[PDB]
Amino acid sequence: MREIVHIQAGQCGNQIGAKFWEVISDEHGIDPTGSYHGDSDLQLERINVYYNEATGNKYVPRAILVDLEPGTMDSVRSGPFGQIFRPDNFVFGQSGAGNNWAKGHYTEGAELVDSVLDVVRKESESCDCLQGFQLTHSLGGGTGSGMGTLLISKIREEYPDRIMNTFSVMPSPKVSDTVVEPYNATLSVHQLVENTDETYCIDNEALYDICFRTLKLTTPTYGDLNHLVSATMSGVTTCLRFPGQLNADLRKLAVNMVPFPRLHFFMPGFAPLTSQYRALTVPELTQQMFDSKNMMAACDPRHGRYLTVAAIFRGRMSMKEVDEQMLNVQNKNSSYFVEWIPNNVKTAVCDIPPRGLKMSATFIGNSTAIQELFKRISEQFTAMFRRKAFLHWYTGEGMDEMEFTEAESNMNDLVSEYQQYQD
Amino acid sequence: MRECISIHVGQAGVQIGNACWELYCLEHGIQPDGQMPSDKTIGGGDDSFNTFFSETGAGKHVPRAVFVDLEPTVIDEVRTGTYRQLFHPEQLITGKEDAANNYARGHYTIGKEIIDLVLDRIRKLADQCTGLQGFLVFHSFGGGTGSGFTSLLMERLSVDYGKKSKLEFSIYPAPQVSTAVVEPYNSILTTHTTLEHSDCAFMVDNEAIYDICRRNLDIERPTYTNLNRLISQIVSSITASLRFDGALNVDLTEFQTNLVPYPRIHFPLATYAPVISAEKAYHEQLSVAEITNACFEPANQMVKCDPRHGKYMACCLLYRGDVVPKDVNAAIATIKTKRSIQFVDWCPTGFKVGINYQPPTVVPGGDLAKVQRAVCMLSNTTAIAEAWARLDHKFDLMYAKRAFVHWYVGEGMEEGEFSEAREDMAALEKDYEEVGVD
Amino acid sequence: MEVIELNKCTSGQSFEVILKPPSDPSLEEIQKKLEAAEERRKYQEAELLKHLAE
Amino acid sequence: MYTFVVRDENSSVYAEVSRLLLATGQWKRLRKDNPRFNLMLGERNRLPFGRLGHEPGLVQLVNYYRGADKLCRKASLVKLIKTSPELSESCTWFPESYVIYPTNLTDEREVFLAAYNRRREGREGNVWIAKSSAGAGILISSEASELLDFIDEVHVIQKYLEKPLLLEPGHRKFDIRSWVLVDHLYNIYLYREGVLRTSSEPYNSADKTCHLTNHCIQKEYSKNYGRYEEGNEMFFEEFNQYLMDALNTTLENSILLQIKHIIRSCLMCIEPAISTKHLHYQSFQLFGFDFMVDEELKVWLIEVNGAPACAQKLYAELCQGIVDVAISSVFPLASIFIKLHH
Ligand SMILES: Nc1nc2c(ncn2[C@@H]2O[C@H](COP(=O)(O)OP(=O)(O)OP(=O)(O)O)[C@@H](O)[C@H]2O)c(=O)[nH]1
Ligand SMILES: Nc1ncnc2c1ncn2[C@@H]1O[C@H](COP(=O)(O)OP(=O)(O)CP(=O)(O)O)[C@@H](O)[C@H]1O
Ligand SMILES: Nc1nc2c(ncn2[C@@H]2O[C@H](COP(=O)(O)OP(=O)(O)O)[C@@H](O)[C@H]2O)c(=O)[nH]1
Ligand SMILES: [Ca+2]
Ligand SMILES: [Ca+2]
Ligand SMILES: [Ca+2]
Ligand SMILES: [Mg+2]
Ligand SMILES: [Mg+2]
Ligand SMILES: [Mg+2]
């Protein structure tokens, strides 16, 4: 009964978090009303990791929905699986955050955080053995970014010995709402560097390119982008939701994936990505799984080196042939795996495939090439900060330029830290 | 009669222990409900099998075993397994959160909180012993509980049972089935703090068991159930002398006397033969010489290494089945004139032979076929140091960058214990080279 | 090639064939190490809470 | 796409093998410390055999036989020949040798002196030679006192072949170097091409220039270097013609039959100790046998080198043969040897 408490904050965090519960609820046989109608006991084997069991055999997601605006959360409550969430777990304000990290972290968010922690405390007090927390949010907005990192800091203060895991959507000018997104992302990244154990870097730039280049979507929407995030989030959590021995919980995952405390930002990958009835062989899954075009972080793996790798194959396939293909990738491209961490590639298999696929593969990599993502944000940050552009939105909320200077230096240090292990 | 207490720590220890105690009952004719029809002394007795089984007034034969795991899932299997009636609740100890493959978490953080409970449960079984010999400790090297908590238990046992012997059955880490990258760390950490507390340890490299299953059993992708069925066979061959009438290795003390002339060098190499696939309708039964000769093929050893390029300090042949001394000597003489068997000068060049007439038992429906005769060789070769070299090399690669060290320091362990444990392995490797090299 | 110490019984027999002659810490100390480690954890957590307090 | 690592930068032979493998486009060289390799061109000293054959999904091959030092050491070879029944102390193609440890440290001092006095009393030739494996330091003397006193200042003392076959014109000494390759299957392949490292100085049975046929000694202390043959290296074609024109015989009958016999006997002797037939990794190795031929056309074994070099003209042909039979046989891609059956 290693329970995980889920939190989704802001527009992006709730829209993506909603699709996540919609996807995994389908894999476990849970309908929109919380009733189980599956046909395999493997669906309920570890259902309590993400679901609570109430009266009447109902399964209630252990999720907390947070936002400073009611807009997106009203859509969730009206969405497909909106009725499955616990009504008390909807914690929202009315002022909004105006895509302003300061508002979410210091002013508006501060006024609402204590009531969110009351819900978290209620959910944790019933857990037999709490693994930790997983947060879904974007770094470019105000609520998910600003209040999201505030919650993480306060959650760590109250549960210091629990694992903190996040799915963090990185902003990109290709899919941009406001020009201050680099500011909000830089401020958040430093919070994540200190207060999370595992962060899946989901780059909206990569999601857009995959929809456009690969999936052949000329005009991708947030719905199209969230389809890739749903499939990826489902893949990376397979080892936590189904019986297994590799990375079966959050702490053991962190022990295998994080050789250094601050280098805990992962590149997720998914295969296949079809734009559809053809059967995909095991060698094909492996090639696509490691292909840059299937990475969700918009970083070139060949530009860096792999510190650790977690692979998850789903479906009825030859586990013998899986071992062969995985060993063939490492043995044929061993120059991209650091030689000072022996056997840094672990492979897990799950019999239950995702909805609509005979089999799939999910890639989780801790590569030094992720620095390209932080350099990108750092360059966009500096382009504006050097002229103090748009700072008044933040100084008006009490912030000082010094705090920006420190966030800039913190991420440039993070980039330097990745660079030393790449050589 | 002198009792022996078995202690199973961590997943590997529990699951392996579950396989052995299953095989013990089949060999001694004990049913899953604990009854033993052949036992005419109801409620007691000082027979050979009583060294491992206690007897209740109702005739139940209870294993003298304790299961410990910082997670409840694995031991819950035994609570509801086929032989759930053999054990009582006091024998099964479980926590809620495991060591997360972190030696420091198993030894310091979580271990410190349950060590007194485990000892109290061990004391209960010890109080049922009129003459306790010692303990047999099953555990893995790579797991956080198998490595971290075992070393703490081995320390306390030496303090509470100073005069008792302690033997290990240790699972050496192999990437083909390993579940953590830091297993080399845990292996070296646990070997350092356990070395002075173990009188004799039988290492089993999962790599060797894995290939034997794929090669000799035609298992394409062996599982833990396949590996443990084979491991319990070797364990049974090793402990058979303690559970049956005989004159070789009659007590735990005799294992050290016959296999360990130097205390630190207490890691005998085990070689088993024959391993035949039960999927073969008919198989030519191997002779005494053929199975004995097979004891010098690296492909049948529990640890892949080349004994030809080392020296022997002792060698025991444990036969089970249709075997007579005349055939053993005829096979030994032939093997001397064909094999490279080099002993150390300060040791005799010979073999201690033990023969049990009851042939090996095979779990019904398993993978191993029934055989007329089988042998397990226990040889203290310096060649087994190759396993230490491999382990120490992987340790050096990661520790040079301090990779993953923060997980251990965060549990309260000091970084100095890494280099301290590594320096001990460095000395251990040096001891092997002085003995087996010129 | 010599055989010595031959013992026979109903369940088997044992012997020895020779081919050639030759040519701990106390409970107090353990408690100290365990408490010393727990003290370093408490110190590390106190610094974190101190950091979060700032 | 096979992988290999290079751990001996001073190997002229395998520097060419590594160059050929890359030229095939199907081999990729990795870092010397990368464990995911198919082939290891290992170092000469302390090659970590214990770490080989433990890579799931990788067939690993190394260019050295673990345990072959017993044959490629001065003191080891003497002990192996005397103590091995396959070779026996009555070996007829190996000079009478003895292992003599320096007094500042089993030993065969008394045994050596016994055979020495027998020759002195019997009027027979009593000239011996002292040498060791730590040489560039060799001493040739007919007095046992000088030999033992020199070692003290581990060596081996063997009978000095006082009646060596002398090439004409020149009246000079020489030695025969044969390259033998043993693959993972323990096939013994003898390179068809040999070389005679001849002395450019006339032989005098009374100065080590005309007695030592080393290529470095002839090119440094000899004043006739390269007079008769280029680089004091005579290949089999010329040597065979000389045997026919002078002695009315051939290299195959008079010498090569004995060389092939000696190669087999040595390698077949240690096969049970070094074979990798049922081992988790495979080994091959190139050997360099050195022979001496007396005036009676009898071949004598001098030593066996485990890391030998090759003649300049024969590097290409031999190195290609190494890739064909020793490397490509285990890792196929997309005869200059003589197989000594046994
Ligand atoms: N032969 C064999 N090896 C096993 C078995 N179970 C686990 N292992 C090995 O043990 C190592 C991991 O140690 P575990 O015993 O699983 O971990 P643990 O002792 O439960 O400690 P925790 O980290 O707290 O879970 C891996 O290298 C596995 O290959 C088993 O049933 N049989
Ligand atoms: N017993 C012997 N009788 C005659 N000549 C001998 C001899 N032992 C050694 N020599 C001479 O000494 C030379 C070199 O001896 P040895 O082979 O031991 O030197 P080395 O090992 O330094 C050269 P390499 O390693 O290239 O063969 C031989 O080529 C031969 O001329
Ligand atoms: N992938 C994805 N990204 C989103 C979505 N909604 C917003 N974003 C991104 O998130 C950033 C805006 O943050 P937002 O979540 O709207 O701010 P918040 O509601 O105040 O926390 C921009 O960089 C957007 O590109 C979504 O549904 N999916
Ligand atoms: Ca207010
Ligand atoms: Ca009884
Ligand atoms: Ca002791
Ligand atoms: Mg928005
Ligand atoms: Mg466990
Ligand atoms: Mg030589």
PDB file of N, CA and C in Angstrom, chain D residues 211-253:
ATOM      1  N   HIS D 211      78.388 -14.788 -31.717  1.00  0.00           N
ATOM      2  CA  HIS D 211      77.671 -15.826 -30.987  1.00  0.00           C
ATOM      3  C   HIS D 211      76.203 -15.497 -30.760  1.00  0.00           C
ATOM      4  N   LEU D 212      75.863 -14.223 -30.583  1.00  0.00           N
ATOM      5  CA  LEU D 212      74.486 -13.795 -30.366  1.00  0.00           C
ATOM      6  C   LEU D 212      73.914 -13.278 -31.680  1.00  0.00           C
ATOM      7  N   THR D 213      72.811 -13.877 -32.121  1.00  0.00           N
ATOM      8  CA  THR D 213      72.188 -13.535 -33.393  1.00  0.00           C
ATOM      9  C   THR D 213      71.073 -12.505 -33.252  1.00  0.00           C
ATOM     10  N   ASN D 214      70.970 -11.841 -32.104  1.00  0.00           N
ATOM     11  CA  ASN D 214      69.926 -10.844 -31.913  1.00  0.00           C
ATOM     12  C   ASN D 214      70.033  -9.747 -32.965  1.00  0.00           C
ATOM     13  N   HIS D 215      68.876  -9.260 -33.421  1.00  0.00           N
ATOM     14  CA  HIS D 215      68.867  -8.231 -34.455  1.00  0.00           C
ATOM     15  C   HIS D 215      69.415  -6.907 -33.938  1.00  0.00           C
ATOM     16  N   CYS D 216      69.189  -6.595 -32.659  1.00  0.00           N
ATOM     17  CA  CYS D 216      69.705  -5.347 -32.107  1.00  0.00           C
ATOM     18  C   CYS D 216      71.210  -5.413 -31.881  1.00  0.00           C
ATOM     19  N   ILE D 217      71.732  -6.590 -31.533  1.00  0.00           N
ATOM     20  CA  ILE D 217      73.166  -6.722 -31.295  1.00  0.00           C
ATOM     21  C   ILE D 217      73.930  -6.723 -32.613  1.00  0.00           C
ATOM     22  N   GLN D 218      73.347  -7.300 -33.663  1.00  0.00           N
ATOM     23  CA  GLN D 218      74.017  -7.329 -34.957  1.00  0.00           C
ATOM     24  C   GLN D 218      74.023  -5.958 -35.621  1.00  0.00           C
ATOM     25  N   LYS D 219      73.001  -5.144 -35.372  1.00  0.00           N
ATOM     26  CA  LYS D 219      72.906  -3.816 -35.961  1.00  0.00           C
ATOM     27  C   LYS D 219      73.630  -2.753 -35.145  1.00  0.00           C
ATOM     28  N   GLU D 220      74.219  -3.122 -34.009  1.00  0.00           N
ATOM     29  CA  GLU D 220      74.923  -2.184 -33.143  1.00  0.00           C
ATOM     30  C   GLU D 220      76.392  -2.532 -32.970  1.00  0.00           C
ATOM     31  N   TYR D 221      76.707  -3.783 -32.640  1.00  0.00           N
ATOM     32  CA  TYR D 221      78.073  -4.196 -32.349  1.00  0.00           C
ATOM     33  C   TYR D 221      78.722  -4.979 -33.483  1.00  0.00           C
ATOM     34  N   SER D 222      78.024  -5.178 -34.596  1.00  0.00           N
ATOM     35  CA  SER D 222      78.558  -5.916 -35.733  1.00  0.00           C
ATOM     36  C   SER D 222      78.954  -4.941 -36.834  1.00  0.00           C
ATOM     37  N   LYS D 223      80.136  -5.153 -37.411  1.00  0.00           N
ATOM     38  CA  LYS D 223      80.669  -4.282 -38.450  1.00  0.00           C
ATOM     39  C   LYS D 223      80.377  -4.783 -39.858  1.00  0.00           C
ATOM     40  N   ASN D 224      79.629  -5.878 -39.999  1.00  0.00           N
ATOM     41  CA  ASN D 224      79.250  -6.412 -41.302  1.00  0.00           C
ATOM     42  C   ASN D 224      77.734  -6.482 -41.451  1.00  0.00           C
ATOM     43  N   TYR D 225      77.016  -5.634 -40.719  1.00  0.00           N
ATOM     44  CA  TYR D 225      75.559  -5.649 -40.754  1.00  0.00           C
ATOM     45  C   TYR D 225      75.056  -5.385 -42.166  1.00  0.00           C
ATOM     46  N   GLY D 226      74.251  -6.309 -42.687  1.00  0.00           N
ATOM     47  CA  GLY D 226      73.669  -6.146 -44.003  1.00  0.00           C
ATOM     48  C   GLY D 226      74.589  -6.462 -45.158  1.00  0.00           C
ATOM     49  N   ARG D 227      75.712  -7.135 -44.906  1.00  0.00           N
ATOM     50  CA  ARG D 227      76.649  -7.442 -45.981  1.00  0.00           C
ATOM     51  C   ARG D 227      76.119  -8.555 -46.876  1.00  0.00           C
ATOM     52  N   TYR D 228      75.689  -9.665 -46.277  1.00  0.00           N
ATOM     53  CA  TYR D 228      75.240 -10.827 -47.035  1.00  0.00           C
ATOM     54  C   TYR D 228      73.757 -10.744 -47.387  1.00  0.00           C
ATOM     55  N   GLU D 229      72.914 -10.410 -46.413  1.00  0.00           N
ATOM     56  CA  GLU D 229      71.486 -10.254 -46.641  1.00  0.00           C
ATOM     57  C   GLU D 229      71.005  -8.987 -45.951  1.00  0.00           C
ATOM     58  N   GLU D 230      69.952  -8.393 -46.509  1.00  0.00           N
ATOM     59  CA  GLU D 230      69.441  -7.130 -45.993  1.00  0.00           C
ATOM     60  C   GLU D 230      68.947  -7.292 -44.560  1.00  0.00           C
ATOM     61  N   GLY D 231      69.461  -6.451 -43.667  1.00  0.00           N
ATOM     62  CA  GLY D 231      69.051  -6.492 -42.273  1.00  0.00           C
ATOM     63  C   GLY D 231      69.386  -7.785 -41.566  1.00  0.00           C
ATOM     64  N   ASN D 232      70.414  -8.498 -42.028  1.00  0.00           N
ATOM     65  CA  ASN D 232      70.795  -9.787 -41.449  1.00  0.00           C
ATOM     66  C   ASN D 232      69.594 -10.721 -41.335  1.00  0.00           C
ATOM     67  N   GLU D 233      68.658 -10.605 -42.275  1.00  0.00           N
ATOM     68  CA  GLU D 233      67.441 -11.408 -42.290  1.00  0.00           C
ATOM     69  C   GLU D 233      67.386 -12.175 -43.605  1.00  0.00           C
ATOM     70  N   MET D 234      67.505 -13.497 -43.524  1.00  0.00           N
ATOM     71  CA  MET D 234      67.419 -14.378 -44.680  1.00  0.00           C
ATOM     72  C   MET D 234      66.114 -15.157 -44.597  1.00  0.00           C
ATOM     73  N   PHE D 235      65.283 -15.038 -45.628  1.00  0.00           N
ATOM     74  CA  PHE D 235      63.996 -15.712 -45.634  1.00  0.00           C
ATOM     75  C   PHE D 235      64.143 -17.149 -46.131  1.00  0.00           C
ATOM     76  N   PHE D 236      63.043 -17.901 -46.043  1.00  0.00           N
ATOM     77  CA  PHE D 236      63.100 -19.335 -46.309  1.00  0.00           C
ATOM     78  C   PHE D 236      63.486 -19.630 -47.754  1.00  0.00           C
ATOM     79  N   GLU D 237      63.028 -18.802 -48.696  1.00  0.00           N
ATOM     80  CA  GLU D 237      63.329 -19.059 -50.102  1.00  0.00           C
ATOM     81  C   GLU D 237      64.833 -19.137 -50.334  1.00  0.00           C
ATOM     82  N   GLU D 238      65.580 -18.160 -49.815  1.00  0.00           N
ATOM     83  CA  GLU D 238      67.031 -18.185 -49.969  1.00  0.00           C
ATOM     84  C   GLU D 238      67.654 -19.316 -49.161  1.00  0.00           C
ATOM     85  N   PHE D 239      67.197 -19.510 -47.922  1.00  0.00           N
ATOM     86  CA  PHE D 239      67.766 -20.562 -47.085  1.00  0.00           C
ATOM     87  C   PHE D 239      67.525 -21.938 -47.690  1.00  0.00           C
ATOM     88  N   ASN D 240      66.334 -22.162 -48.252  1.00  0.00           N
ATOM     89  CA  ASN D 240      66.050 -23.449 -48.878  1.00  0.00           C
ATOM     90  C   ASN D 240      66.965 -23.694 -50.069  1.00  0.00           C
ATOM     91  N   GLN D 241      67.201 -22.662 -50.882  1.00  0.00           N
ATOM     92  CA  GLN D 241      68.103 -22.815 -52.019  1.00  0.00           C
ATOM     93  C   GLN D 241      69.518 -23.137 -51.556  1.00  0.00           C
ATOM     94  N   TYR D 242      69.959 -22.518 -50.458  1.00  0.00           N
ATOM     95  CA  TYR D 242      71.292 -22.801 -49.935  1.00  0.00           C
ATOM     96  C   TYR D 242      71.416 -24.260 -49.514  1.00  0.00           C
ATOM     97  N   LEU D 243      70.418 -24.768 -48.785  1.00  0.00           N
ATOM     98  CA  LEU D 243      70.457 -26.160 -48.350  1.00  0.00           C
ATOM     99  C   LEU D 243      70.538 -27.116 -49.533  1.00  0.00           C
ATOM    100  N   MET D 244      69.889 -26.773 -50.648  1.00  0.00           N
ATOM    101  CA  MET D 244      69.931 -27.627 -51.832  1.00  0.00           C
ATOM    102  C   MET D 244      71.276 -27.526 -52.539  1.00  0.00           C
ATOM    103  N   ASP D 245      71.777 -26.302 -52.728  1.00  0.00           N
ATOM    104  CA  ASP D 245      73.046 -26.125 -53.424  1.00  0.00           C
ATOM    105  C   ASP D 245      74.221 -26.630 -52.598  1.00  0.00           C
ATOM    106  N   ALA D 246      74.154 -26.490 -51.274  1.00  0.00           N
ATOM    107  CA  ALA D 246      75.271 -26.861 -50.411  1.00  0.00           C
ATOM    108  C   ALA D 246      75.127 -28.280 -49.865  1.00  0.00           C
ATOM    109  N   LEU D 247      74.079 -28.526 -49.078  1.00  0.00           N
ATOM    110  CA  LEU D 247      73.907 -29.802 -48.396  1.00  0.00           C
ATOM    111  C   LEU D 247      73.105 -30.819 -49.199  1.00  0.00           C
ATOM    112  N   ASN D 248      72.553 -30.433 -50.348  1.00  0.00           N
ATOM    113  CA  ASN D 248      71.775 -31.348 -51.184  1.00  0.00           C
ATOM    114  C   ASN D 248      70.542 -31.860 -50.434  1.00  0.00           C
ATOM    115  N   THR D 249      69.799 -30.929 -49.843  1.00  0.00           N
ATOM    116  CA  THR D 249      68.563 -31.249 -49.137  1.00  0.00           C
ATOM    117  C   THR D 249      67.653 -30.026 -49.194  1.00  0.00           C
ATOM    118  N   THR D 250      66.519 -30.104 -48.504  1.00  0.00           N
ATOM    119  CA  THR D 250      65.532 -29.037 -48.505  1.00  0.00           C
ATOM    120  C   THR D 250      65.257 -28.572 -47.081  1.00  0.00           C
ATOM    121  N   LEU D 251      64.663 -27.381 -46.976  1.00  0.00           N
ATOM    122  CA  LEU D 251      64.280 -26.855 -45.671  1.00  0.00           C
ATOM    123  C   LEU D 251      63.176 -27.688 -45.033  1.00  0.00           C
ATOM    124  N   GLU D 252      62.273 -28.241 -45.844  1.00  0.00           N
ATOM    125  CA  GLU D 252      61.185 -29.051 -45.306  1.00  0.00           C
ATOM    126  C   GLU D 252      61.714 -30.320 -44.646  1.00  0.00           C
ATOM    127  N   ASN D 253      62.585 -31.052 -45.342  1.00  0.00           N
ATOM    128  CA  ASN D 253      63.044 -32.337 -44.824  1.00  0.00           C
ATOM    129  C   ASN D 253      64.044 -32.156 -43.687  1.00  0.00           C
TER     130      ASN D 253
END
